[PDB]
UniProtKB/Swiss-Prot annotation, chains A, B:
It comes from Saccharomyces cerevisiae (strain ATCC 204508 / S288c) (Baker's yeast). Residues 6-27 are annotated as: Leucine-zipper. Induction: Translation is induced by amino acid or purine starvation, or during growth in low or poor carbon sources. Translational repression during nutrient-rich conditions is dependent on four uORFs (upstream open reading frames) present in the 5'-UTR of the mRNA; these promote ribosome dissociation. Translational induction occurs in conditions reducing translation machinery efficiency, leading to ribosomes scanning over the uORFs, and increased translation of the mRNA. The rapid translational induction is followed by transcriptional induction at later time-points, independently of the uORF sequences. It comes from the Eukaryota. This is General control transcription factor GCN4. The chain holds residues 250 to 280 of 281 of the full protein. Master transcriptional regulator that mediates the response to amino acid starvation. Binds variations of the DNA sequence 5'-ATGA[CG]TCAT-3' in canonical nucleosome-depleted 5'-positioned promoters, and also within coding sequences and 3' non-coding regions. During nutrient starvation (low or poor amino acid, carbon or purine sources), it activates genes required for amino acid biosynthesis and transport, autophagy, cofactor biosynthesis and transport, mitochondrial transport, and additional downstream transcription factors. Phosphorylated by the cyclin-CDK PCL5-PHO85.
Length: 33, 33
């Protein structure tokens, strides 16, 4: 109910946020060194 | 109440998701061409 579905929606975006940010870090290493 | 605060939390992650993904796209252009 509510919280667990809304929070599951938030956390799912948190998961791709994890992926994007990690992807950025990897790319910015090549656009870094 | 609930929805507007939970959804505001989701949408805020959606905002950085926008930034990360955009940042990835820019970086992957340099790690692309």
């Amino acid at each position: 109910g509510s919280m667990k579905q809304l929070e599951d929606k938030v956390e799912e975006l948190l998961s791709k946020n994890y992926h994007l940010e990690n992807e950025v870090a990897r790319l910015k290493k090549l656009v870094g060194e």
